[PDB]
């Protein structure tokens, strides 16, 4: 449940959780001195055992703490944008932000239900569906750029 | 009171002591995300008060938490035996044992308590010291070595 995300640089190994295999989400300490994902952690407890999965070592949830350092540096480490063509990094906290904007990212066009490029997503709304809604100059209706001819052979005009 | 050594791999600034300037010993963690030396900042709060030094955000020691995964980083840096002469390089886990056995630690004679490297003891002891025992073959009592000359002079026969 780690950041599943390409780090530039690549991220580093004590920035890792041995569970997910995956940067440290909301990290944690044990006392034997192990970080992990909360949420992995306390379900690898609830799950495999009240143990440690690496050193076997007994774990006590309510003796865990929040590695507060090591989620600082994490959330700072330059990310590329998993949604394609991005190059320019960004520190991982804003990610967030990033993809409530993305031009480069991929989302659906509800006319005909179907992703395009954030850049050419509304290009394709207007001019290239064949099931967008153009109406007939006559009749009014509204019908697919596909389906626009044939309407017209029996169309009430 | 933090690691006073010279690390053989630069020391970084992750595992520095905000208060000493040294290497973190025995490495605790705040809850705002800053380590500090278990000596320092337990001294830092019983001195000033309940606080955390650089951000000024609220802080117990109850709150305080051991930072083993930083501790075990630590103990694992090469570095430098402080004596001066030594040139044997190891990890910081075995400073200790060298130091208490190293040759080049500065020891008391026995005789004049003059400071000395460890290893030079041995000679001093023998040959360089003026309180070391010798004996004269006319009475044979032990005596200082500087006052040979004021008893050869006087010797009973
Ligand atoms: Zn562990
Ligand atoms: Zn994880
Ligand atoms: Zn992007
Ligand atoms: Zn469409
Ligand atoms: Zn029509
Ligand atoms: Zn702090
Ligand atoms: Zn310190
Ligand atoms: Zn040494
Ligand atoms: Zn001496
Ligand atoms: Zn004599």
Redesign the interface.
Known sequence: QGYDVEFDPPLES?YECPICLMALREAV?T?????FCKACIIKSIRDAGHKCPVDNEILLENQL?????????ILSLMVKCPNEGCLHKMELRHLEDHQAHCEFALMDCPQCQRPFQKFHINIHILKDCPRRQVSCDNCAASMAFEDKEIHDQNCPL
């Open positions: 004590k300490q006392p034997c001195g192990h970080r703490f929040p590695d507060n350092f090591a989620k600082r540096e």
